[PDB]
């Protein structure tokens, strides 16, 4: 009927925007598709994640560049320094916080649910943790504390589901532990937890690699290499 046609058109335009590298449009089209009320297939879920990941990804990069300039400018190295760096770093911050807020609102209002397979539920709760983590990267003081709590809560509920209903080699479970360990290291200043979680995730999956097909082996190992690389850097030294 009408809903299905309109939803199909939005999904189609989201794919066109992907090919045109119009990720803000892509995110808007997928947001609209979600609001049609139907659950997202695995493919559609990725389109949603890819869209907003590129949008916020560019903002995070821009924020990091401007913050670095701000530190040098505020250290008398550039000598006389104006407020323009801060004002522009704050504009980029506000834009990033708005996108995260939009994503978090959509997750709570349409995507996070008690029903659905474990992968979908884990996928969205992990997404909730990620975007609270992106807010944490730019937050300060009390707001940072609350956001960190919301991130840990979302990650933890996803961990509980993945450890109960998914095998140690599931790529979504692996990606979740990877991002949660990053949260431990970078956001929560808990390197011991980050190393422990990353080390446990790699080893417990390493033991099950021989049970995987040729494809599942590549999907799971692709993320295990990210875990090992982080461990090498975290364990080798500060």
């Amino acid at each position: 009927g009408a809903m299905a046609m309109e939803r199909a058109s939005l999904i189609q335009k989201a794919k066109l925007a992907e090919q045109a590298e119009r990720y803000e449009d892509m995110a808007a089209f997928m947001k609209g598709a979600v609001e049609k009320g139907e659950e997202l297939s695995c493919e559609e879920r990725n389109l949603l994640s890819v869209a907003y990941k590129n949008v916020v990804g560019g903002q995070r990069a821009a924020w990091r560049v401007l913050s670095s300039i701000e530190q040098k400018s505020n250290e008398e190295g550039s000598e006389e320094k104006g407020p323009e760096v801060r004002e522009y770093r704050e504009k980029v911050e506000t834009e990033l916080q708005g996108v995260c807020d939009t994503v978090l609102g959509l997750l709570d209002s349409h995507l996070i649910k008690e029903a659905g397979d474990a992968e979908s539920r884990v996928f969205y709760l992990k997404m909730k943790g990620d975007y609270y983590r992106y807010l944490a990267e730019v937050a300060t003081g009390d707001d940072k504390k609350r956001i960190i709590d919301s991130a840990r809560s979302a990650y933890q509920e996803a961990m509980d589901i993945s450890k109960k209903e998914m095998p140690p080699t599931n790529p979504i479970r692996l990606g979740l532990a990877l991002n949660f360990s990053v949260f431990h290291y970078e956001i929560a200043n808990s390197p011991e937890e980050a190393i422990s979680l990353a080390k446990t995730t790699f080893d417990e999956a390493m033991a099950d690699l021989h049970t995987l097909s040729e494809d599942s082996y590549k999907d799971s190992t692709l993320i295990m290499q990210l875990l090992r690389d982080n461990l090498t850097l975290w364990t080798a030294d500060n």
Partner: peptide, 10 residues
């Protein structure tokens, strides 16, 4: 970006 450790996205 400055950071060397990665998340699953990239």
């Amino acid at each position: 970006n400055y950071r060397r450790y990665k998340s699953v996205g990239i």
